[PDB]
CSV table of C-alpha atoms in Angstrom, one decimal:
chain,number,residue,atom,x,y,z
A,1,UNK,CA,-10.1,8.3,18.9
A,2,UNK,CA,-7.1,7.8,18.1
A,3,UNK,CA,-5.0,3.8,16.8
A,4,UNK,CA,-2.5,2.6,16.5
A,5,UNK,CA,-1.1,-0.9,14.7
A,6,UNK,CA,2.1,-2.7,13.3
A,7,UNK,CA,2.6,-3.3,9.9
A,8,UNK,CA,5.8,-5.9,9.7
A,9,UNK,CA,7.0,-7.2,6.0
A,10,UNK,CA,5.1,-10.9,5.0
A,11,UNK,CA,9.4,-11.7,3.9
A,12,UNK,CA,12.5,-10.9,3.9
A,13,UNK,CA,11.9,-8.2,0.9
A,14,UNK,CA,9.1,-6.2,2.5
A,15,UNK,CA,7.4,-7.5,-0.9
A,16,UNK,CA,4.0,-6.1,1.7
A,17,UNK,CA,2.7,-5.5,5.1
A,18,UNK,CA,0.5,-7.3,6.9
A,19,UNK,CA,-1.3,-5.3,9.8
A,20,UNK,CA,-3.3,-7.1,12.5
A,21,UNK,CA,-6.9,-6.1,12.6
A,22,UNK,CA,-10.0,-7.8,14.1
A,23,UNK,CA,-13.5,-8.2,12.4
A,24,UNK,CA,-16.3,-9.4,14.5
A,25,UNK,CA,-17.6,-10.1,17.3
A,26,UNK,CA,-15.8,-12.3,18.9
A,27,UNK,CA,-13.1,-10.9,17.5
A,28,UNK,CA,-11.1,-13.4,14.6
A,29,UNK,CA,-8.3,-11.4,13.5
A,30,UNK,CA,-6.7,-11.8,10.4
A,31,UNK,CA,-4.0,-9.7,9.0
A,32,UNK,CA,-4.1,-7.0,6.6
A,33,UNK,CA,-2.1,-5.3,3.8
A,34,UNK,CA,-2.8,-2.0,3.8
A,35,UNK,CA,-3.8,-0.3,0.4
A,36,UNK,CA,-4.3,3.1,-0.1
A,37,UNK,CA,-4.5,2.0,-3.5
A,38,UNK,CA,-7.6,0.6,-3.5
A,39,UNK,CA,-11.3,1.0,-1.4
A,40,UNK,CA,-12.6,-2.7,-0.5
A,41,UNK,CA,-11.5,-3.9,3.0
A,42,UNK,CA,-12.7,-8.3,1.4
A,43,UNK,CA,-11.5,-11.7,2.9
A,44,UNK,CA,-10.2,-15.2,3.1
A,45,UNK,CA,-13.5,-16.5,5.0
A,46,UNK,CA,-16.1,-19.4,5.1
A,47,UNK,CA,-17.0,-19.0,1.7
A,48,UNK,CA,-13.6,-18.8,0.4
A,49,UNK,CA,-13.5,-22.0,-2.9
A,50,UNK,CA,-11.9,-24.2,-0.9
A,51,UNK,CA,-9.3,-25.2,-3.5
A,52,UNK,CA,-8.0,-21.5,-3.1
A,53,UNK,CA,-7.6,-21.6,0.6
A,54,UNK,CA,-4.2,-22.8,1.7
A,55,UNK,CA,-2.6,-21.2,4.8
A,56,UNK,CA,-4.5,-18.3,4.7
A,57,UNK,CA,-6.3,-17.1,8.3
A,58,UNK,CA,-10.5,-16.9,7.7
A,59,UNK,CA,-12.8,-14.9,8.7
A,60,UNK,CA,-16.0,-17.1,9.6
A,61,UNK,CA,-19.3,-14.5,9.7
A,62,UNK,CA,-21.1,-17.1,11.4
A,63,UNK,CA,-19.3,-17.0,14.4
A,64,UNK,CA,-19.9,-14.1,14.4
A,65,UNK,CA,-22.3,-12.1,16.5
A,66,UNK,CA,-21.9,-8.6,15.0
A,67,UNK,CA,-21.9,-10.9,12.3
A,68,UNK,CA,-24.9,-9.2,9.0
A,69,UNK,CA,-25.3,-9.9,5.9
A,70,UNK,CA,-25.7,-7.6,3.4
A,71,UNK,CA,-28.1,-8.0,0.8
A,72,UNK,CA,-27.9,-7.8,-2.5
A,73,UNK,CA,-24.3,-7.1,-2.1
A,74,UNK,CA,-21.7,-8.2,-4.9
A,75,UNK,CA,-17.5,-7.1,-5.1
A,76,UNK,CA,-15.9,-7.6,-7.5
A,77,UNK,CA,-11.9,-6.8,-7.6
A,78,UNK,CA,-8.3,-6.1,-10.2
A,79,UNK,CA,-4.9,-4.7,-9.1
A,80,UNK,CA,-2.3,-4.0,-10.9
A,81,UNK,CA,-0.3,-7.1,-10.8
A,82,UNK,CA,-3.8,-8.6,-12.3
A,83,UNK,CA,-4.5,-10.8,-9.4
A,84,UNK,CA,-8.2,-10.3,-8.7
A,85,UNK,CA,-10.7,-11.1,-6.2
A,86,UNK,CA,-14.7,-10.9,-5.9
A,87,UNK,CA,-18.2,-12.0,-3.2
A,88,UNK,CA,-20.3,-11.3,-1.2
A,89,UNK,CA,-20.6,-8.4,1.4
A,90,UNK,CA,-21.2,-8.7,5.6
A,91,UNK,CA,-21.0,-5.8,7.6
A,92,UNK,CA,-19.1,-5.8,11.2
A,93,UNK,CA,-17.3,-4.1,14.1
A,94,UNK,CA,-13.5,-4.0,13.0
A,95,UNK,CA,-11.1,-2.7,14.4
A,96,UNK,CA,-7.4,-1.5,14.1
A,97,UNK,CA,-5.1,-1.2,16.6
A,98,UNK,CA,-7.5,0.0,18.7
A,99,UNK,CA,-9.7,2.0,16.8
A,100,UNK,CA,-13.3,0.6,16.1
A,101,UNK,CA,-16.3,0.5,13.4
A,102,UNK,CA,-19.3,-0.1,14.2
A,103,UNK,CA,-20.9,-1.3,10.7
A,104,UNK,CA,-18.8,-1.4,8.3
A,105,UNK,CA,-18.1,-3.1,5.5
A,106,UNK,CA,-16.4,-6.6,5.3
A,107,UNK,CA,-16.2,-8.1,2.2
A,108,UNK,CA,-16.3,-12.4,1.9
A,109,UNK,CA,-14.2,-13.9,-1.2
A,110,UNK,CA,-16.0,-16.5,-2.7
A,111,UNK,CA,-13.0,-16.4,-5.6
A,112,UNK,CA,-9.9,-14.7,-5.5
A,113,UNK,CA,-6.7,-15.3,-8.0
A,114,UNK,CA,-3.8,-18.3,-8.2
A,115,UNK,CA,-1.4,-15.7,-6.5
A,116,UNK,CA,-3.8,-14.5,-3.6
A,117,UNK,CA,-3.7,-18.8,-2.9
A,118,UNK,CA,0.1,-18.4,-3.3
A,119,UNK,CA,0.2,-15.9,-0.5
A,120,UNK,CA,-0.3,-17.2,3.0
A,121,UNK,CA,0.8,-14.1,4.7
A,122,UNK,CA,-1.7,-11.7,3.6
A,123,UNK,CA,-5.8,-13.2,4.4
A,124,UNK,CA,-6.7,-10.1,3.3
A,125,UNK,CA,-6.8,-6.2,2.3
A,126,UNK,CA,-8.4,-2.9,4.1
A,127,UNK,CA,-8.1,-0.9,1.4
A,128,UNK,CA,-7.4,3.7,2.1
A,129,UNK,CA,-7.4,5.1,-1.0
A,130,UNK,CA,-11.2,7.3,-1.7
A,131,UNK,CA,-14.2,5.6,-1.2
A,132,UNK,CA,-15.5,6.4,-5.1
A,133,UNK,CA,-13.2,2.9,-6.3
A,134,UNK,CA,-15.3,0.8,-3.7
A,135,UNK,CA,-16.5,-2.0,-6.1
A,136,UNK,CA,-19.3,-3.0,-4.1
A,137,UNK,CA,-22.2,-3.2,-6.3
A,138,UNK,CA,-25.9,-1.6,-5.9
A,139,UNK,CA,-24.0,0.4,-3.1
A,140,UNK,CA,-21.0,1.4,-2.9
A,141,UNK,CA,-19.3,0.9,0.4
A,142,UNK,CA,-16.9,3.0,2.6
A,143,UNK,CA,-13.6,2.6,3.6
A,144,UNK,CA,-12.2,1.6,7.4
A,145,UNK,CA,-10.8,5.0,7.0
A,146,UNK,CA,-14.0,7.3,5.4
A,147,UNK,CA,-16.5,5.1,8.3
A,148,UNK,CA,-13.7,5.8,10.9
A,149,UNK,CA,-12.9,10.2,10.4
A,150,UNK,CA,-15.6,12.2,11.5
A,151,UNK,CA,-14.5,10.2,14.5
A,152,UNK,CA,-11.1,11.1,15.2
A,153,UNK,CA,-9.0,13.1,16.6
A,154,UNK,CA,-7.9,14.4,13.1
A,155,UNK,CA,-9.4,12.8,10.2
A,156,UNK,CA,-5.6,11.1,8.9
A,157,UNK,CA,-4.2,8.2,8.8
A,158,UNK,CA,0.2,8.0,8.7
A,159,UNK,CA,2.1,5.5,6.8
A,160,UNK,CA,5.5,4.5,8.8
A,161,UNK,CA,7.0,2.0,7.3
A,162,UNK,CA,9.8,0.0,7.8
A,163,UNK,CA,12.9,-1.6,5.4
A,164,UNK,CA,13.4,-5.2,6.8
A,165,UNK,CA,11.6,-4.1,10.0
A,166,UNK,CA,8.4,-3.5,11.5
A,167,UNK,CA,6.8,-0.5,10.8
A,168,UNK,CA,3.2,1.6,12.0
A,169,UNK,CA,-0.4,2.7,10.5
A,170,UNK,CA,-1.6,5.5,12.9
A,171,UNK,CA,-5.2,6.8,12.1
A,172,UNK,CA,-6.6,10.2,14.1
A,173,UNK,CA,-2.6,11.5,15.6
A,174,UNK,CA,0.3,12.3,13.4
A,175,UNK,CA,3.2,10.5,16.1
A,176,UNK,CA,5.8,13.7,16.3
A,177,UNK,CA,8.4,11.2,17.5
A,178,UNK,CA,8.0,9.4,14.8
A,179,UNK,CA,10.1,12.0,11.8
A,180,UNK,CA,12.8,14.4,11.3
A,181,UNK,CA,12.5,17.4,10.6
A,182,UNK,CA,8.7,18.9,9.1
A,183,UNK,CA,6.7,17.1,7.4
A,184,UNK,CA,6.3,19.0,3.9
A,185,UNK,CA,2.2,18.3,2.9
A,186,UNK,CA,1.2,18.8,-0.6
A,187,UNK,CA,-1.2,19.0,-3.0
A,188,UNK,CA,-3.9,16.1,-3.8
A,189,UNK,CA,-6.2,15.4,-6.9
A,190,UNK,CA,-9.0,12.9,-6.1
A,191,UNK,CA,-10.0,12.6,-9.7
A,192,UNK,CA,-8.9,9.1,-10.4
A,193,UNK,CA,-9.9,7.9,-6.6
A,194,UNK,CA,-6.2,7.7,-5.2
A,195,UNK,CA,-4.2,9.8,-2.9
A,196,UNK,CA,-2.5,12.1,-6.6
A,197,UNK,CA,0.3,14.0,-6.0
A,198,UNK,CA,3.3,15.9,-7.8
A,199,UNK,CA,5.9,15.2,-7.3
A,200,UNK,CA,9.0,18.1,-7.7
A,201,UNK,CA,11.3,16.4,-9.8
A,202,UNK,CA,14.1,13.7,-8.4
A,203,UNK,CA,17.5,13.2,-8.3
A,204,UNK,CA,20.5,9.8,-9.2
A,205,UNK,CA,23.0,9.2,-6.2
A,206,UNK,CA,25.3,12.3,-5.7
A,207,UNK,CA,24.0,13.7,-8.5
A,208,UNK,CA,21.8,17.9,-9.3
A,209,UNK,CA,19.2,17.1,-8.5
A,210,UNK,CA,16.5,17.4,-11.5
A,211,UNK,CA,13.7,20.0,-11.9
A,212,UNK,CA,10.3,18.2,-13.3
A,213,UNK,CA,6.8,17.2,-12.5
A,214,UNK,CA,5.7,13.8,-11.9
A,215,UNK,CA,1.9,13.3,-11.0
A,216,UNK,CA,1.3,9.6,-9.8
A,217,UNK,CA,0.1,8.4,-6.6
A,218,UNK,CA,1.7,7.0,-3.2
A,219,UNK,CA,0.5,3.5,-2.7
A,220,UNK,CA,1.3,0.6,-0.1
A,221,UNK,CA,-0.1,-1.7,-2.0
A,222,UNK,CA,2.5,-1.5,-4.9
A,223,UNK,CA,5.8,-2.5,-3.8
A,224,UNK,CA,7.8,-0.8,-6.1
A,225,UNK,CA,8.6,2.4,-7.6
A,226,UNK,CA,7.8,3.0,-10.5
A,227,UNK,CA,8.8,5.9,-12.6
A,228,UNK,CA,8.4,7.4,-16.6
A,229,UNK,CA,10.5,5.7,-19.0
A,230,UNK,CA,13.5,8.5,-18.4
A,231,UNK,CA,13.6,9.0,-15.7
A,232,UNK,CA,13.9,4.4,-14.4
A,233,UNK,CA,16.4,4.7,-17.3
A,234,UNK,CA,19.0,8.2,-15.4
A,235,UNK,CA,18.6,6.0,-12.7
A,236,UNK,CA,20.1,2.4,-14.3
A,237,UNK,CA,22.8,3.8,-16.0
A,238,UNK,CA,24.7,4.8,-13.0
A,239,UNK,CA,24.8,1.1,-11.9
A,240,UNK,CA,27.6,-0.9,-14.2
A,241,UNK,CA,25.4,-4.3,-15.8
A,242,UNK,CA,22.0,-3.0,-15.3
A,243,UNK,CA,19.5,-3.2,-17.8
A,244,UNK,CA,15.8,-3.3,-18.5
A,245,UNK,CA,15.3,-7.6,-19.9
A,246,UNK,CA,11.4,-7.6,-21.5
A,247,UNK,CA,11.9,-11.6,-20.4
A,248,UNK,CA,12.4,-11.0,-17.0
A,249,UNK,CA,9.8,-8.5,-16.5
A,250,UNK,CA,11.9,-4.9,-16.1
A,251,UNK,CA,15.7,-3.7,-14.9
A,252,UNK,CA,17.8,-6.6,-12.7
A,253,UNK,CA,21.6,-5.7,-12.0
A,254,UNK,CA,24.3,-8.1,-10.9
A,255,UNK,CA,24.1,-8.5,-7.9
A,256,UNK,CA,27.2,-7.3,-7.3
A,257,UNK,CA,26.9,-3.7,-7.7
A,258,UNK,CA,26.1,-0.6,-5.0
A,259,UNK,CA,23.1,1.2,-6.3
A,260,UNK,CA,22.9,4.5,-5.9
A,261,UNK,CA,20.4,6.0,-3.2
A,262,UNK,CA,17.6,7.8,-5.8
A,263,UNK,CA,15.6,10.9,-4.1
A,264,UNK,CA,12.2,13.2,-5.0
A,265,UNK,CA,11.5,15.9,-4.3
A,266,UNK,CA,8.2,17.3,-2.3
A,267,UNK,CA,7.7,19.8,-2.8
A,268,UNK,CA,11.5,22.2,-2.0
A,269,UNK,CA,12.0,19.1,0.5
A,270,UNK,CA,13.4,16.5,-0.8
A,271,UNK,CA,13.4,12.6,0.0
A,272,UNK,CA,16.3,10.0,-0.4
A,273,UNK,CA,15.8,6.4,-0.8
A,274,UNK,CA,18.6,4.3,0.3
A,275,UNK,CA,20.3,2.6,-2.5
A,276,UNK,CA,19.3,-0.3,-0.3
A,277,UNK,CA,15.8,-0.8,-0.6
A,278,UNK,CA,16.2,-0.3,-4.0
A,279,UNK,CA,17.5,-4.0,-4.3
A,280,UNK,CA,15.2,-6.7,-4.7
A,281,UNK,CA,17.3,-9.9,-4.7
A,282,UNK,CA,17.9,-12.6,-7.7
A,283,UNK,CA,15.9,-13.1,-10.5
A,284,UNK,CA,15.6,-16.7,-8.8
A,285,UNK,CA,17.1,-18.8,-6.2
A,286,UNK,CA,20.7,-18.7,-7.1
A,287,UNK,CA,20.5,-16.7,-9.3
A,288,UNK,CA,23.6,-13.4,-9.1
A,289,UNK,CA,21.4,-11.1,-11.5
A,290,UNK,CA,18.7,-8.8,-9.4
A,291,UNK,CA,15.5,-7.1,-9.9
A,292,UNK,CA,15.7,-3.7,-8.4
A,293,UNK,CA,12.9,-1.3,-6.7
A,294,UNK,CA,12.6,1.1,-9.3
A,295,UNK,CA,10.3,0.3,-12.9
A,296,UNK,CA,9.5,1.8,-15.7
A,297,UNK,CA,5.3,2.9,-14.7
A,298,UNK,CA,5.3,3.1,-19.0
A,299,UNK,CA,2.2,0.6,-19.6
A,300,UNK,CA,1.4,1.3,-16.3
A,301,UNK,CA,-0.5,4.8,-17.6
A,302,UNK,CA,0.3,6.3,-14.6
A,303,UNK,CA,3.1,6.6,-11.9
A,304,UNK,CA,2.8,4.3,-8.8
A,305,UNK,CA,5.5,5.4,-5.5
A,306,UNK,CA,4.6,2.4,-4.1
A,307,UNK,CA,6.8,0.8,-0.9
A,308,UNK,CA,9.9,1.0,-2.0
A,309,UNK,CA,9.3,4.9,-1.8
A,310,UNK,CA,7.4,4.8,0.6
A,311,UNK,CA,9.6,3.3,3.0
A,312,UNK,CA,11.5,6.1,3.1
A,313,UNK,CA,9.1,9.0,4.6
A,314,UNK,CA,6.9,9.0,7.4
A,315,UNK,CA,3.6,10.1,5.2
A,316,UNK,CA,0.4,11.9,6.4
A,317,UNK,CA,-2.6,11.1,4.8
A,318,UNK,CA,-4.5,14.6,4.8
A,319,UNK,CA,-8.1,13.0,5.0
A,320,UNK,CA,-9.7,16.6,5.3
A,321,UNK,CA,-12.3,17.9,3.4
A,322,UNK,CA,-9.3,19.4,0.7
A,323,UNK,CA,-7.2,15.7,1.4
A,324,UNK,CA,-3.2,17.0,1.5
A,325,UNK,CA,-0.4,14.5,1.3
A,326,UNK,CA,2.6,15.0,4.0
A,327,UNK,CA,5.8,13.7,4.0
A,328,UNK,CA,8.7,14.0,6.4
A,329,UNK,CA,12.8,12.2,6.6
A,330,UNK,CA,13.1,9.8,9.5
């Protein structure tokens, strides 16, 4: 089997991407944030505290003939931005782009933090990291990809995120028309439950490539590119007027600037992030200070290849017995 679904930016900055997901019978379609940095599929629901729902579409398990309460199971999760949610669990039929999993754990939110309430466009998350990170207790649950894997033509999914444009998540096959050149594969460590890999270095603009190992995660659920302070300083030093602002919470730059590209290494191959991808717009409405899309990972504890990086590539998440990651230009 295979599946294919379009993923769409939630706003004009590509802050996140939503993908429609069919849950239950008859189908209830919710727009979920596919997140390769977490492993819970959770949704706004009829059980979510009323004051914490503001425009999202909810899953109502009582209206699904295939929903079953997973007795005794609860979940609770926190993300890198400090947001959180928690609740109980149902099993139900979940389909993505034509690919159907029965008995998928659908984690129903009783509580969500303000950041979720305030974002009307995201109805929940669909985790695509390794199932060892799933927060369901007392019986950990498998991700949608893990449940689908054995039925797929090939045990893979691919992320093809657009810049200010829709893109595609595919399951079970590699669309060879979707990228240019070849896909370069690189080793993955699953020790932390993430799609963790080591980039071979970087370049700033037309500058020379610096060969240096950068361990980080491929995380579709993080907006920006978070890299070591040395790397980030080297980037922003090429932008007149750019500075790290403690009050704003990262590097900012004059909105009048033209940003240089940023290249990262995948083995001997190179992925180029165009400078425009690194512009996240005014820090506040009407400001001439713009927020940078490359930021320091210092004090996150890990480097994160988020959407800024991933959207410059066609990315293969290879879930073979020994997982690997593949990157191609496009």
